[PDB]
Structure 1
């Protein structure tokens, strides 16, 4: 009785990625006798099928089958679903990987709460978030929130196999379609799936390669909007719950239809803009009710209005007025305190991190700044930000540079003010203070030695700016906290990074060394090297080593000796143990804690 079936459609699969896929499944904490691997090759030209069988040689739970090419992943996933015998199915693409505890955590979460779909936290290579809303907390009763509980609607979730089979839930392969994972997840919810969200552990890594697509399907504007029309018609005809239908109509109208009416207009030729604008206008009139836009922000209500009027020229004019609106955060102070790293940051809305972004106070109204030729074409309520000045968000986030996983940094406090800069003009300014407990984000053992990058997420007046936290001054601060070496620093791009476990930087080199305070107890053979500036909390002992070379003998072998990085009584030191090495004269001394050597140029005389 198999707990999990891994459905993997392959087609001309790149060999290295296929090997990484196999290693990520082999390293599951779940016992191998309790999951199943089903690979369906979709008529590959490469030796992919031969290699899939070569992989299946060593695995009594991996099944491989070859069919002729179907042009997409829908057909192989459906056949593999009919071949599977596990309780839950994971649709794993041939270029992705899975985190090592995914199978065990997901199944126990699904079995305990009797879930039909488990939406586990998904990681993507690029970006500072993915599912920032939906992956914010575990929710075993997520389907009570509505169909939103399945976003983002990738197919990389865990589905109850008998639920799919009893409701005839398959990927649309009889027709050629984009967003097949959106159809698949919506059908799952329409038939009443009990959904749970597992957000406290990264379950799936969706990897950005360089060859994600090479087909003629979807690249032209006519096929694109044919697919968009088919998706909206699918919602209006199949979603029976009014709340769920309104969510899907609002979410997809805002992102894919109104989404071409902003900066997109500045990145495309007039021939393409004219084609897509007419399609979008026609869809709004034909499929999108007027009430959908009443629950949108002021800016999206402006785009919706001008779209239905065919006033593309005003939209182009608005795209240029809006070009560059953003909110970058600067570090006001960064310091360690007890076992945490503390930050104080500040931001404001600007054009491209330069002059201030402004709104106007006219009478009792807080208005968007527009030329009077634009304001004379719009309902006056659509550029009035009065009822929106308290809807600002300002939050920190972190991202592991190895795992690519992103997390919100909890416990932060912020405050956004609408301040009168000059005359009747108002700028928007934010301040925020937060701390980082690095253990919150260390889930796999690999996470203990990793660089982390800090970012801030600012939303308001309809704009969203999620950008790396930055600092102008040189920032280098080290800490030895409960056996964790930590270095917060301005990296070479001017952004804020945090190294933990000497992944990229040397804590001895960044702390400095009191050279004139080095002690040499030659009877015990112990060389003590006090570190200069370092925040030490708790007791630490990190084993490492060091290298000695006789000065002047430039070709000499390193003399390998043991070393210890010690934190105690809020001081840090490196102790080098000479041991049985007989030494006489001056020597270069280089410490090697956690695989990172210092550049302090230490010389001792023995």
Structure 2
């Protein structure tokens, strides 16, 4: 009885990525006999099919099959879905990887809640967030929130196989189709799929490769956009779900070219896509959709229907550079957490303040008179929107690429009158980091982490790395965790845990005049200078001794321990049975990171 079937369409697959893919599947905690691998090669010109057969020699649950070239992976996925015999289907691309506990966690969550679709937390290489809203916390009954529960609509979820067949849910293999997973996930919800969101564990890694061009030209792009919008209006029968998909895709893909997109494209490309977007808004988008959009997007929709492209270009110049960068006001360790105080304000490129202007009873967007004398009065009136600001912290593992919201933060955003009638938008936030909240695999215990802040307001979303101007290096030894918060070479805030990029002995310093040598016991005690120590810690390492002067001598390897107790830290070096006379260099090697403290001892 097979629980999970892994559908993998392959075509000229990069071998190293294929080896990583096979590795991540082998590392699954689920028993290998409870799952199966269904590979379907899309007629690879290279030796991809021969390699897939070589992988299948040592794995009896892996089934390989080759088909004619089809151009995309929807047909290979369909053939593999019919060959598959597991309760749940995962559509894994040939250049992605799966986290080691995904199968057991996802199946248990779906089986216990009788889920037809398990939308598990997905990780991407770049960016500070992915599925920030949906991958917040677990939701066994996510379909009760509407079709939004399936966003982001990648095919990298788990689908109950019998549910797909009972409703004839396949991939669009009739022709080349952009966003084929939006059709797929939407069809699932249209047929009443019980959807659950598994957000407490990274299930899938969507890897960026650089080699990742159909639809790049403007005509096939808007041909697929018209095809996707028609599908929404024709297949989605629930009004709330239809209005959501219409609003979400009109805002992101149609109105999404009416802002900064206008400043990085030539005129003849703008005209083709502006006219395409104008006809689509008139023919397919009802007017009530824009009535529940934000002020700035209402302006874009209004001018689009007027054909006022020149005003949208001028607005794009006015809006260029708006952002919110957070500065570290304070950063320190207290007990077993790292504490932060951050501040931010809306600016143009971390420089002069962004302003809104107060006129009588309205807080208005600052616009030229030519543009204001064309828009409805309410479209640039931010008065009723000044209480929707959010200011939150996030974290990203530099190895796993997984991103998380940091819970428990305290933030506040004020609108402050700076000069005359101009108002700036200021934020203050304090939060703490408990690194155990984000360590889910064993590999997470040794990793550098990067801190970011997420600010939203007046339609703007700014998710940037946390930064600081002054030098910042602070260390901690907390319950067997070496921790270093520091300003990296880019001026951003990083947190090394487990000596993955820095040495805690180097960054803490050594009280070199306080080093103790016990000749009879052979112990050398090296107390650390500046470090926050909480709880008991013992990390085994080693040290190397070299005679001073004899620059070519073999290193004398010797046991060493990094100890944290009574709020103090030290490295104990054990000379053991080594007979030593003279002066020696001493270099500690804790967790693979050596120090540069120039330690010399005389024996």
- What TM-score range do you get, normalising by the shorter chain? over 0.9
The CA distance in 2 between the partners of 1:287 and 1:557, in whole Å, is 77
Structure 2 residue 250 is the aligned partner of structure 1 residue 253:
yes
For residues 587 and 473 of structure 1, the distance between their equivalents in structure 2, rounded to whole angstroms, comes to 36
State the distance in 2 between where 1:407 and 1:313 align: 40
List runs of 5+ in structure 2 lacking aligned partners: none
For 2:518 and 2:588, the matched residues in 1 are separated by: 17
Unaligned runs of 5+ in 1: none
The corresponding residue for 1:363 is 360
Shift, 1:219, TM fit: 1.2
Partner of 1:276: 273
Q: Give CA deviations for 1:118-174 in whole Å, capped at 9, x if unaligned.
A: 000000000000000000010000000000000000000000000001100000001
Counterpart CA distance in 2 for 1:567 and 1:74 is 56
Q: Please give the per-residue CA displacement for 1:203-243, whole angstroms capped at 9, x wherever unaligned.
A: 000000011xxx95201101000000000000000000000
SS in 1 for 2:3: strand
Query: What is the RMSD computed on CA atoms of the aligned residues?
Result: 0.6
SS of residue in 2 equivalent to 1:37 = strand
SS in 2 for 1:254: helix
CA distance in 2, matches of 1:290, 1:56: 56
SS in 1 for 2:183: helix
Give CA-to-partner distance per residue, 1:105-124, whole Å, 9 cap, x none.
00000000000000000000
1:310-329 CA-to-partner distances (Å, cap 9, x unmatched) read 00000000000000000000
CA distance in structure 1 between the partners assigned to 2:245 and 2:295 by the alignment = 20
Residues 448-468 of structure 1 deviation map (CA, whole Å, 9 limit, x = unaligned): 000000000000011000000
Secondary structure at 1:2 match in 2: coil
Query: How far off its partner does 1:585 sit?
Result: 0.4
Displacement after TM superposition at 1:552 (Å): 0.4
Name the structure 2 match of 1:191.
191
Structure 1 residue matching 2:105: 3-state secondary structure? helix
Query: Over residues 388-409 of structure 1, what are the superposed CA-to-partner deviations in whole Å (9 max), with x where a residue is unaligned?
Result: 0000000000000000000000
Counterpart CA distance in 2 for 1:405 and 1:56 is: 30
Report how far residue 176 of structure 1 moved: 1.9
* Deviation beyond 4 Å, 4+ runs, structure 1: none
- Whole-Å Cα distance in 2 between the matches of residues 39 and 122 of structure 1? 22
Quote the residue 1:171 is aligned against. Answer: 171
Deviation string, structure 1 residues 60-113 (Cα, Å, up to 9, x no partner): 000000001110010000000000000000000000000000000000000000
The DSSP-based 3-state class of the residue aligned with 1:86 is: coil
Hey, what's the Cα distance between the residues in 1 that align with 2:126 and 2:292?
A: 30
SS in 1 for 2:584: strand
Over 3 Å counting, the alpha-carbon distance change for 1:99 and 1:462 in structure 2 is same
Offset at residue 175 of structure 1 (A): 2.3
1:486 aligns with: 483
The DSSP-based 3-state class of the residue aligned with 1:440 is: helix
Which residue in 1 is equivalent to 2:84? 84
Which of 209, 213, 217 lines up with 1:216 in the alignment?
A: 213
Take 2:291 and 2:585, find their aligned partners in 1: how far apart are those partners?
72
Separation in 2, partners of 1:80, 1:453: 39
Q: CA deviation at 1:538?
A: 0.2
Corresponding residue for residue 430 of structure 1: 427
Shift of 1:579: 0.4
The one-character-per-residue Cα deviations of 1:470-502 (angstroms, maximum 9, x if unpaired) are: 000010000000000000000000000000000
SS at match of 1:231: helix
> Matched residue of 2:521: which SS?
coil
Q: Distance in 2 between matches of 1:381 and 1:429?
A: 24
Q: What is the distance in 2 between the residues matched to 1:175 and 1:524?
A: 78
What is the distance in 2 between the residues matched to 1:210 and 1:283? 32
Deviation, structure 1 residue 334: 0.1
Separation (CA, whole Å) in 1 of partners of 2:360 and 2:322: 25
Closer, same or farther in 2 for the Cα pair 1:334/1:243, shift >3 Å?
Answer: same
CA deviation after TM superposition for structure 1 residue 521, in Å: 0.3
| In structure 1, C-alpha distance between the alignment counterparts of 2:453 and 2:72, rounded to whole Å | 38
Q: Using the alignment, how far apart are the partners of 2:586 and 2:175 within structure 1?
A: 69
Q: What's the CA shift for 1:19?
A: 0.3
1:251-295, Cα deviation, whole Å (9 max, x unpaired): 000000000000000000001000000000000000000000011
Q: CA deviation at 1:336?
A: 0.2
Distance 1:216 1:595, change over 3 A: closer
Counterpart-to-counterpart distance in 2, 1:216 and 1:572? 56
Q: Secondary structure at the match of 2:87?
A: strand
Residue 30 of structure 1 is matched in structure 2 by 30
Please state whether the residue corresponding to 1:184 is helix, strand or coil. Answer: helix
- The CA distance in 1 between the partners of 2:65 and 2:331, in whole Å, is 56
Partner in structure 2 of residue 7 of structure 1? 7
CA distance in 1, matches of 2:171, 2:241: 21
TM-score when scaled to structure 1? 0.99
Give CA-to-partner distance per residue, 1:568-591, whole Å, 9 cap, x none.
000000000000001000000000
Q: Structure 1: how far apart are the matches of 2:411 and 2:325?
A: 15
1:525-563 CA-to-partner distances (Å, cap 9, x unmatched) read: 000000000000000000000000000000011100000
Q: How far apart, CA to CA, are the structure 2 residues paired with 1:112 and 1:592?
A: 47
Residues in 2 aligned to 1:181 and 1:550: alpha-carbon distance in whole angstroms: 65
2-structure distance, mates of 1:237, 1:126? 35
How far apart, in 2, do the equivalents of 1:208 and 1:174 lie?
Answer: 27
Q: What is the Cα deviation at residue 58 of structure 1?
A: 0.5
